Design a protein around this ligand. Sequence first.
Ligand SMILES: [Zn+2]
Ligand SMILES: [Zn+2]
Length: 227
Amino acid sequence: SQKVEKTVIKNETGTISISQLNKNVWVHTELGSFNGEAVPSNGLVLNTSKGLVLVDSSWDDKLTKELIEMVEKKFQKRVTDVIITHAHADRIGGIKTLKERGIKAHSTALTAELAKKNGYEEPLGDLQTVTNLKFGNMKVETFYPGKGHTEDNIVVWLPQYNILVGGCLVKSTSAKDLGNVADAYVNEWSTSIENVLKRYRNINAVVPGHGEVGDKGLLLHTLDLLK
Ligand SMILES: [Zn+2]
Ligand SMILES: [Zn+2]
């Protein structure tokens, strides 16, 4: 009888929020913790018929669980697939839970090479620079403009909605710099972004590594700080 009239999906705690980009895709944002502060990591939920999908897992298995025990009933679809942009706590951080239940972490051969270097699991890694994926009525093509946020940092592209997932590689409007370039290549970063605005210019919406979806303006944003 009693119900609210909202679109997004924010749990009682308010840590995990999923905004519906349209009617077949959402943006799951898992809030972590920077030791006293909050670290909201946006994402992308694909509403397919073959199974639910989320771009980049949660910070830690502790968070991922709360994200899988909420979307599995809210979306009416069980998660069994996840796209990995690179090797980071905001990507495969919760892979431990994705490779325990039955979630295939699609990634590039390299993504499954540097992942263990940090102590993470081993994803599919059966991807490449430019490839086409199919998750049942859900087409997802990747892209490797070069080195930037990581050694295999890539950007998920969706030709079904012209949506792009710049990820950490592409800073958000609410950013002042890249921050932490130890595991990244600022020498190729500016070179990778320029490729996402020269080749994959056509974008209806871009989702950075943190914050929310926007536009191509996020691409030039990275170079505006990593310059
Ligand atoms: Zn990252
Ligand atoms: Zn990040």
